[PDB]
Symmetry: D2
Subunit: 120 residues, 4 copies
């Protein structure tokens, strides 16, 4: 029960988890370029688990990109955004469990992080 990184996606129009949403994760590279890190599709409960492991999850800059436009086109709704992106630094600073959650509407989105830890 150790997932250093988890993504959750919700739909504000229908009051349900946003199922089958593509998610891509990149790590900032030395040349200051984005390199593919992990990717997947949200499950029936709007979640994506097992993107990585504590050993591979070192300090650095990460970018989480959510394909919100494909989600909305499948419902027959025209969206405003091309995609939703979250960029943050992961620091061993202290606590290492990260939950990124995204709430989606056709013209707006909100994102929040919940950073927590078992013990230390």
């Amino acid at each position: 029960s150790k997932c250093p990184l988890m993504v959750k996606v919700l739909d504000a129009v229908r009051g349900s988890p946003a199922i089958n949403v593509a998610v891509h994760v990149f790590r900032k590279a030395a040349d200051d370029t984005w390199e593919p890190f992990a990717s997947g599709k949200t499950s029936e409960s709007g979640e994506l688990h097992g993107l990585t492991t504590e050993e591979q999850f070192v300090e650095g800059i990460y970018k989480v990109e959510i394909d919100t436009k494909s989600y909305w086109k499948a419902l027959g709704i025209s969206p405003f955004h091309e995609h939703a992106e979250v960029v943050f630094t992961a620091n061993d600073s202290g606590p290492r469990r990260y939950t990124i959650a995204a709430l989606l509407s056709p013209y707006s989105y909100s994102t929040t992080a919940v950073v927590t830890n078992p013990k230390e």
Copy 2:
């Protein structure tokens, strides 16, 4: 009015159409001497999603006020059956003298957010 020095203004936006939320009914109450809510002001949002002229500086004394927005009538007229009955904002006002209050609401059928911007009147 002036430019924007109203003691109380409400602004409602639509997260589904990316537009101002027009013709939304808004009701404001003040808590009375007896723990009961009394009618204070009423109105509807204009074509830019705003509601101006609800009160005056002199009438807007210190107190606990309730801003109730009728979101359910708004989604229903669009053919959508939403989650909430209404949106309500409860807050203590003019506590440490007069201030100008902007209450904003962003609406979606199963979600809403609300924010306040408080400014100190011509200092």
Copy 3:
């Protein structure tokens, strides 16, 4: 694993669950008055479970009130809101699992409902 109603509370300032937040639930009465239904305090994970049961959870109007002001005063932050309230109708219409989530900041809050169901 059957909780018709669950409440989740998060803190936007500190990126953590909002722990020990008082929550009260009322049911609209015939005289159109609010009657105490259930109450509790959020756990270490920001959640409140077991407010009720499927038999007691009949159709009607419910009001969930979150004591946000006490939460913020304990951190030494002066808040704008007296409390956060969610009013909704529970209809057997179809699906009966309700998750109310609230995200808190000193001057703003957002609430969303996730309505779902196992089978039917």
Copy 4:
């Protein structure tokens, strides 16, 4: 300017202090012919949390634009170490002719929301 017919306006608010987010750096890019982001316009929010005058109707052609807000420099100057590096909004503009775009952001240290209000210019 006029009253409010700017093709692109940005508005940043602070959810912790209930105020406009003043002196926030904003950078806008357009995707070029070669899948690369090119600099388009730059600026800072004023005392009301707004940014006016970034472009003109004639210069704002159809394309994919990126609005990047520097939220991290804003929280840091307040003594707070926030979660995000910045906030970014990516969207296709003027696709089916000219429109006026208002991008709003509401900020908190570990959260942000963004909304767009799109209007059809003097019809």
